[PDB]
Amino acid sequence: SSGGDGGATKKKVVVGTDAAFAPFEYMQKGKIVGFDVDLLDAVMKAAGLDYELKNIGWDPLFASLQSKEVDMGISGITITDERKQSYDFSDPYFEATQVILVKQGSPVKNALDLKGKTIGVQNATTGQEAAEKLFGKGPHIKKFETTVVAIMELLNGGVDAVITDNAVANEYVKNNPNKKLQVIEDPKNFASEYYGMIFPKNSELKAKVDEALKNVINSGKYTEIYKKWFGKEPKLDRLKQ
């Protein structure tokens, strides 16, 4: 029993996030809110698992999954083959794509127009990878610890464009008409992406979360949550690809 409490209290599942990614997770009057926050609460409750959500940030979240200090993550995280080498994922719960966020005056009409330009991304994201895919890795791509800061460098002209997830870019534009930004989609260039909850490799929580996610989808709770954040019916068939 050394190092533990010999079972005196069942410990809570430690869930990490980077709450700087509206509408999925963000801070509002000192609380973490968003689509992921709601979906997590429904999932863990269906699983019967007491939990704590921590706003630990993006790069720390991955480091902490590796060490198993954090048991689980939800953070608008794309399921990728490279990530699967290090972590496990739940079944998918959302579909997304990368998009190009620019100022309304921008001449950018597609990804190839970014040649010779500076691109802001959040570090170690699928947006960074998509940016690197275009013309290769290099210092022309500026990497920030939050998507928030990437967008701030767009606003002040530090970068020419940001590559980030479509619902985040769309939500930012909707909430900030005064900033006169626009979203440029390039479906021939960018791939379909699916979000999953993330776990350390070999996690006992995965199977429980997959079952609870199905429970939440099947009961109609998923679509209530989706309607709350996105104002339209989900196409649930996107979750069976």
Ligand SMILES: NC(=[NH2+])NCCC[C@H](N)C(=O)O
């Ligand atoms: N909460 C966040 N900062 N999420 C960033 C997610 C970006 C992208 N979906 C990825 O998995 O790389």
